Each structure stands twice: as C-alpha cells, then as structure tokens.
Amino acid sequence: ANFLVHSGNNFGAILSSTNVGSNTY
Amino acid sequence: ANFLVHSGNNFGAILSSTNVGSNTY
Amino acid sequence: ANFLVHSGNNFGAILSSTNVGSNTY
Amino acid sequence: ANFLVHSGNNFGAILSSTNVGSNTY
Amino acid sequence: ANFLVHSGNNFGAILSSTNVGSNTY
Amino acid sequence: ANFLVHSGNNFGAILSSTNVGSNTY
Amino acid sequence: ANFLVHSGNNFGAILSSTNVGSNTY
Amino acid sequence: ANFLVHSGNNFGAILSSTNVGSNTY
Amino acid sequence: ANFLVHSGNNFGAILSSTNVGSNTY
Amino acid sequence: ANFLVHSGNNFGAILSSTNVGSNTY
C-alpha cells in the first residue's frame, strides 16, 4: 500500500512550472 | 491499494503551468 | 483499488494551464 | 475498482485552460 | 508500505521549476 | 490642463482589487 | 500641464491589489 | 510640464501589492 | 520640465510590494 | 530639466519590497 497525504500548503504564485503541489505516482 | 489525499491547499495564482495541485496517477 | 480524494482547495486565478486541481488517472 | 472524489474546491477565475477541477479517466 | 506526508509548507513564488512541494513516487 | 491616456492594456484576471486600469483623478 | 500616457502593458493576474496599471492623479 | 510615459511592461502575477505599473502623481 | 520614461520591463512575480515598476512623482 | 529612463530590466521575483524598478522623484 502507498499513502500520499497533502495538506495545508500555501502557494503564492506559480509561473511556467510543472508538478507543483501534486501527488504524482 | 493506492491512496491519494489532497486537502486545504491555497494557490494564489497559476500561469502557464502543468500538473499543479492534482492527483496524477 | 485506487482512491483519489480532492477537497477544500482554493485557487485564486488560473491562466493557460493544464491539469490543475484535477484527479487524472 | 477506481474511486475519484471531488469536493469543496473554490476556483476564482480560469482562462484558456484544460482539465481544471475535473475527474479525468 | 510507503507513507508520504506533506503539511504546512509556505511557498512565496515559483518560476520555471519542476517537482516543487510534491509527493513524487 | 491635465491629460490622461489609457490604451492597449491587456489584463488577464482581476480579483478583489481596486483602481485597476483606471484614470483616477 | 501634466501628461500621463499608458500603453501596451500586459498583466497576467492581479489579486487583492490597489492602484495597478492606473493613471492616479 | 510633467511627462510620464508607460509602455511595453509585462507583469506575470501581482498579489497584495500597491502602486504597481502605475503613473502616480 | 520632468520626463519619466518606462519601457520594456519584464516582472516575473510580485508579492506584498509597493511602488514596483511605477513612475512615482 | 530631469530625465529618467528605464528600459529592458528583467525581474525574476519580488517579495515584500519597496521602490523596485521605479522612477521615484
């Protein structure tokens, strides 16, 4: 089993970016 | 089994970006 | 079994972006 | 079995974007 | 079993970046 | 005499803002 | 005499801001 | 006489800011 | 006479800032 | 007479700053 948890992350500004704040499997 | 959890993430502004705040499998 | 959960995510503004705040399988 | 859950996501403004806030299979 | 936990991370500004604030498997 | 000229300005997305792209006197 | 000229300015995304791209007198 | 000229400025993303890309007198 | 000229300035991302890319008099 | 010229300046990311890339008089 694989568990991925993402919580309470604040991102100000994202430009021309990939795989940011994501659960990539 | 694979578990992906995404919660409570604040994103200010996103421009020309890919796979942001997503559960990609 | 695969479980993907998406909850309580606030997105300010999205421009010319792909796969944002999505459950991609 | 595949389970995809999408809830309580607030999107401010979306322009020229693809696959945003969607359950893509 | 693999457990990945992401919480309470503040990101000011992200430009032309990859795999930032993400659980990559 | 006061001259104010506003031309050819492209605005992507505006949220909770005041006095944007305006000639304020 | 006061001359203010505003032309050809591209703004991606504006959030919770004041006096942006404006001729304020 | 006072001359203020604003041209060809590209702004990616603006958050919680004041007097950005403006001719303030 | 006072001449202020602003041209061809690229700004990536601006957060919680004042008097950025402006002709302040 | 006072002449101020601003051209071709690239700014990556600005946070909590004052009087950046501006013609202040």
From Swiss-Prot, chains A, B, C, D, E, F, G, H, I, J:
Modified residues (Tyrosine amide): 25
Annotated phenotype, changing residue 3 to A/D/S: Promotes formation of fibrillar aggregates
Subcellular location: Secreted
Post-translational modification (record): Amyloid fibrils are degraded by insulin-degrading enzyme IDE.
Superkingdom in the source lineage: Eukaryota
Family statement: Belongs to the calcitonin family.
UniProt remark on domains: The mature protein is largely unstructured in the absence of a cognate ligand, and has a strong tendency to form fibrillar aggregates. Homodimerization may be the first step of amyloid formation.
Function: Amylin/IAPP is a glucoregulatory peptide hormone that plays an important role in the regulation of energy homeostasis. Selectively inhibits insulin-stimulated glucose utilization and glycogen deposition in muscle, while not affecting adipocyte glucose metabolism. IAPP function is mediated by the CALCR-RAMPs (AMYRs) receptor complexes. Amylin can also bind CALCR receptor in the absence of RAMPs, although it is more selective for AMYRs.
Additional comment: IAPP is the peptide subunit of amyloid found in pancreatic islets of type 2 diabetic patients and in insulinomas.
Subunit (UniProt): Can form homodimers. Interacts with IDE and INS. Interaction with INS inhibits homodimerization and fibril formation.
Name of the protein this chain belongs to: Islet amyloid polypeptide
Species for this entry: Homo sapiens
Gene name per UniProt: IAPP
Shown chain mapped onto the complete sequence: 46 to 70 of 89
